[PDB]
């Protein structure tokens, strides 16, 4: 997998060497094709994993993501052509390159055989992200948000560093292939009960768990649209990908060491879903929607039943695409409105007829409408959770009712009701804004036709 | 300085560490340490400002008593073994003295009070020498005697330094002292692995030298001893803003950059030796060091602090360039990580 | 560590014994990296000194890309030796002190009974 | 090119990684042994050199 | 030692006088010269860990 990567690196030379006026089209047009080369990995004609080479591999779980990581770079660069079009021609070429490095790094992290290669690349992605959030962040508080995003991930990260070096000494190689075909069975000691927490905690932090998710609402609030898309679509899912590949070892402990997180997540799912119900900042509501719909995932990567896992793989890819779509349209309202407040800007369909159709489809993806991969995902996690304990439906049942309420409230108070009297007149929709959306949903429609590709390792 | 004097001093400041390293007769190692003490004091008071005399008088007393303690260890050994050099048989207290003493000259842990203060009153230039070409000498003496020193003490001085360095740095706003504090911290990691794998001490030093030397020549390019002063870097010289950003995050352990390797292999070696207690606590507060590094990042790069009109005047004039060393030592430092296996 | 080994060359860079090892291919990814590492140093310099970034010092750019690379071949040539000594040393010991490193026997998975923890 | 290439490539990747793993662990055991044993080329700490002991006939007769 | 510029250069400015059995002036043998020899020709080729 060096075509999904080397051609990517070369994007950096192109963003720099290219003309200031033509820099945007060379980069966006080329990475669209970079995504097309990424699609070749999907050609798996047998169940064996495609080990491209010693360090680089792609199995069913990584492949559905590498393609998404390559896909969003085009979109990210199309959603940030407006803001970042007021810059000095060298601030742009920095932002474009920053976005380019994220998927170079993220493509490799999702396509990495050695778990510590994951760690080095895993924690590197913070550098590009923190720059995108802090350097271009509009609000006074991004310095703070950046600190929260760096420390919560970093304090979790050093325990994983110690744990992975620890298993290398215990087993003798951090190669995901071998670690899988070798006998690593923890022994339920008090210490192992700590190892397990060391490995999972760093992944559980960037996958916002109810206890440590305050970093994500603060980060996406002041982050520029491209950073918020990256955090929701690819960055948070880095934590999920890690939990799937790391729990191959630590096989016995999670049977009983998971209860704490599972309950934290399911109760967390309800409270995070509910506070979405009365949050005035739209970007705030989407972020907590992201916490709740990701709290379902940590509760399926821990129950560990075949269906959970691919419920997880289905939902992660699906929610990634949906969340960005929501964060992308939130930005289009923010740029014309100039405020994140949900109460202002009422009645837009009256003035932006189509964006409202995109808003409606994004919300229906947000809630579980049935001919969507989003629902298949939740339906499956719901099933397994029920298997874990029939009572789980109650808590995963209060979340579904709340999820319907906030998803439609975003449509009802932003895209319906009487028009706002006279905010700065709202200029019509650009074709870029609409495509950036179409590019998010057309793939959501196509993937829903053949869900098999994003089903995970389990199935 | 009459250029002749400059030569004699500089030769001594350079013959000082070199005799230490080359000789085996400890005595000759002691005088190497003594010559470094004598040579550095003249340069320290070059401005001869009231702050400077204070700096040198502290540096000298701290250095002198430690030098006398190191000599006492050699004198005691001479009577416990006729040899003029530490051996397997050496009384444990004899070696511990040498650790404390040498940990004072290097300024590690509970003896970390002199360094921040002398780093504050000396010029940026002599600051570098006082931080990096004066650590080579004592460390050489320790690295030579590693097989014999105590694993317990070193670790305590190691952990303490890491903490003191980190905590001290958080509050400081003067750059010279932020660096002094970082050096205390890095010096700590170095002395942590000495008992186990000296060869890694020599990596955690070089990388520190290849990181700090560019960082200081950056601070002085604009001669800013204040963060507020380095924050207006964007107006005075915009290009160094990019690398100053990466070098400081490299000084802390963040993974893509070269700075991770020293911490990573030291942690790998300590876990190989089973200190998974000690290594864990060190790595954790090591993360505190990055917080103050990033706070500076914020002021200098990620956010643009307001500047002064008189600055437009300094832009007009051609900026005297930064030596080539900056580049070669900025890149070899910010990104060599892809070449780690051969470094270790 | 590896110092104190018999025959150690007290101050030599790479003992001739390292002649036995294969020479590093000049295009070894690593030496090529050092090259790029170098080009960047050059470009960076131009930038910090405020010169046209790429179109200036085309002589220097060469000195850099060619100094770093030169350094590489002769360094890697050594680091490669050091690692090679490590095996000579390591493998030898495994034998000279055989009992301490016995070849234990591993049973087929049939014989071994690994406890089955149901997931349910 | 086929199912054959990845299956055979993955087995080659596993053999390199399995062999690297066994050796890395054996290093840690050899390095534990030579440190304490001191019977191997690594961890051979120095003692004075007999090349300076003066074996000359000295003045007193008991040298 | 750390940098053996002495062995390399072949010079011996610091080794000739490190132990009591080294050449004493006018060959006035030291005291304990009967033993240090016996204790360093023993520990020669045997590293410290096994000179102890």
């Amino acid at each position: 997998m060096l075509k999904i990567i080397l051609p990517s690196l070369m994007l950096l030379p192109l963003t720099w060497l290219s003309s200031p006026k033509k820099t945007w089209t060379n980069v966006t047009s080329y990475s669209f094709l970079i995504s097309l080369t990424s699609l070749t990995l999907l050609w798996q004609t047998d169940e064996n994993y495609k080990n491209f080479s010693n360090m680089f591999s792609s199995d069913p779980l990584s492949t559905p993501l590498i393609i998404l990581t390559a896909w969003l770079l085009p979109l990210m660069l199309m959603a940030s052509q407006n803001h970042l079009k007021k810059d000095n021609n060298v601030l742009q070429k920095l932002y474009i390159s920053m976005l380019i490095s994220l998927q170079i790094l993220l493509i490799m992290t999702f396509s990495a055989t050695e778990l510590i290669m994951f760690y080095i690349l895993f924690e590197a992605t913070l550098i590009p992200t923190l720059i995108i959030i802090t350097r271009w962040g509009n609000q006074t508080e991004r310095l703070n948000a950046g600190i929260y995003f760096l420390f919560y991930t970093l304090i979790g990260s050093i325990p994983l560093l110690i744990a992975l070096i620890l298993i290398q000494n215990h087993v003798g190689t951090l190669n995901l292939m071998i670690l899988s075909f070798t006998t690593h069975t923890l022994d339920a000691s008090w210490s192992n009960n700590l190892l397990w927490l060391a490995c999972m905690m760093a992944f559980l932090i960037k996958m916002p768990l109810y206890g440590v998710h305050l970093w994500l609402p603060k980060a996406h609030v002041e982050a520029p649209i491209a950073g918020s898309m990256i955090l929701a679509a690819i960055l948070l899912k880095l934590g999920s990908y890690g939990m799937i590949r790391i729990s191959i070892i630590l096989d016995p402990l999670t049977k009983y060491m998971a209860y704490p997180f599972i309950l934290l997540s399911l109760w967390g799912m309800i409270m995070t879903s509910s506070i979405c119900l009365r949050q005035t900042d739209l970007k705030s509501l989407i972020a907590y929607s992201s916490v709740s719909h990701m709290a379902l995932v940590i509760a399926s990567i821990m129950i560990q039943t075949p269906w959970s896992f691919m419920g997880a793989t289905m939902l992660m890819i699906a929610h990634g695409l949906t969340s960005s779509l929501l964060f992308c349209l939130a930005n289009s309202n923010y740029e014309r409105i100039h405020s994140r407040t949900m109460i202002m800007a009422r009645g837009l369909q009256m003035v932006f007829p189509l964006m409202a159709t995109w808003w409606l489809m994004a919300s229906l993806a947000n809630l579980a409408l049935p001919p969507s991969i989003n629902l298949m995902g939740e339906l499956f996690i719901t099933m397994s959770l029920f298997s874990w304990s029939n009572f789980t439906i109650i808590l995963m049942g209060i979340n579904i009712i709340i999820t319907g309420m906030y998803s439609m409230y975003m449509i009802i108070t932003t895209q319906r009701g009487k028009l706002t009297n006279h905010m700065i007149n709202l200029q019509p929709s650009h074709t870029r804004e609409l495509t950036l959306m179409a590019l998010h949903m057309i793939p959501l429609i196509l993937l829903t036709t053949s869900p098999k590709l994003i089903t995970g390792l389990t199935m | 300085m009459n250029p002749i004097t400059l030569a004699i001093i500089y030769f001594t400041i350079f013959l000082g560490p070199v005799i230490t390293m080359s000789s085996t007769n400890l005595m000759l190692m002691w005088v190497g340490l003594e010559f470094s003490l004598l040579a550095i004091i003249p340069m320290l008071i070059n401005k001869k400002n009231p702050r400077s005399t204070e700096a040198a008088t502290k540096y000298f007393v701290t250095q002198a008593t430690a030098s006398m303690i190191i000599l006492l260890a050699i004198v005691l050994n001479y009577k416990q073994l006729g040899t003029w050099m530490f051996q397997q048989q050496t009384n444990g207290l004899i070696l511990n003295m040498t650790l404390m003493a040498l940990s004072m000259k290097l300024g590690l842990a509970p003896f970390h009070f002199w360094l921040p203060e002398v780093t504050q009153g000396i010029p940026l230039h002599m600051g570098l020498i006082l931080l990096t070409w004066q650590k080579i000498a004592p460390l050489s003496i320790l690295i030579q005697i590693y097989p014999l020193l105590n694993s317990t003490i070193i670790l305590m001085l190691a952990i303490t330094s890491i903490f003191m360095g980190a905590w001290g740095g958080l509050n400081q706003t003067q750059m010279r002292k932020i660096m002094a504090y970082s050096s205390i911290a890095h010096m700590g990691w170095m002395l942590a692995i000495l008992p186990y794998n000296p060869s890694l001490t020599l990596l955690n030093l070089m990388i520190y030298i290849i990181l700090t030397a560019p960082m200081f020549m950056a601070l002085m390019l604009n001669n800013s001893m204040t963060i507020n002063s380095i924050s207006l870097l964007w107006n005075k010289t915009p290009a160094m803003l990019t690398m100053i950003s990466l070098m400081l995050l490299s000084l802390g352990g963040l993974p893509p950059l070269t700075g991770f390797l020293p911490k990573w292999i030291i942690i790998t070696e300590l876990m190989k030796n089973n200190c998974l207690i000690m290594a864990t606590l060190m790595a954790m507060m090591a993360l505190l060091n990055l917080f103050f590094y990033t706070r500076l990042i914020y002021s200098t790069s990620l956010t643009m602090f307001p500047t002064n009109n008189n600055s437009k005047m300094m832009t007009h004039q051609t900026k005297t360039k930064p030596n080539l060393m900056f580049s070669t030592l900025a890149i070899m430092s910010t990104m060599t990580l892809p070449l780690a296996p051969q470094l270790i | 560590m590896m110092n104190g080994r018999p025959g150690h060359e007290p101050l030599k860079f790479l003992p001739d014994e390292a002649r036995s090892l294969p020479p590093p291919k000049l295009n070894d990814p690593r030496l090529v990296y050092m090259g790029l590492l170098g080009y960047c140093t050059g470009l960076m310099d131009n930038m910090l000194r405020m010169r046209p970034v790429m179109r200036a010092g085309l002589h220097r750019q060469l000195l850099f890309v060619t100094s770093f690379v030169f350094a590489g071949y002769f360094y890697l040539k050594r680091q490669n030796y050091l690692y090679a000594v490590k095996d000579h040393d390591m493998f030898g010991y495994i034998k000279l002190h055989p009992e301490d490193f016995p070849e234990k026997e591993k049973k087929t998975y049939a014989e071994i009974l690994e406890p089955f923890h149901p997931v349910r | 090119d086929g199912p054959e290439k990845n299956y055979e490539k993955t087995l080659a990747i596993l053999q390199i990684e399995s062999e690297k793993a066994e050796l890395r662990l054996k290093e840690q055991e050899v390095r534990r042994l030579m440190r304490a044993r001191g019977d191997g080329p690594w961890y051979q700490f120095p003692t004075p050199e007999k090349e300076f002991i003066d074996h000359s006939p000295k003045a007193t007769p008991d040298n | 030692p750390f940098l053996d510029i002495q062995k390399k250069l072949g010079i011996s400015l610091d080794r000739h006088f490190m132990f009591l059995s080294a050449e004493q002036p006018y060959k006035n043998a030291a005291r304990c010269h009967a033993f240090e020899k016996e204790w360093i020709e023993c520990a020669h080729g045997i590293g410290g860990t096994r000179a102890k």
Binding site: - | I344 | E17, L21, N80, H88 | E19, Q44 | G47
Partner: peptide, 27 residues
């Protein structure tokens, strides 16, 4: 009796096995 000299590792160097075996470096 003078203690026996440590034994001597013997042979000729051969390129290291599988290369630097550092974390994930095919090398």
């Amino acid at each position: 009796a003078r203690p026996e000299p440590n034994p001597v590792i013997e042979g000729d160097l051969k390129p290291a096995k599988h290369g630097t075996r550092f974390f994930f470096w095919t090398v």
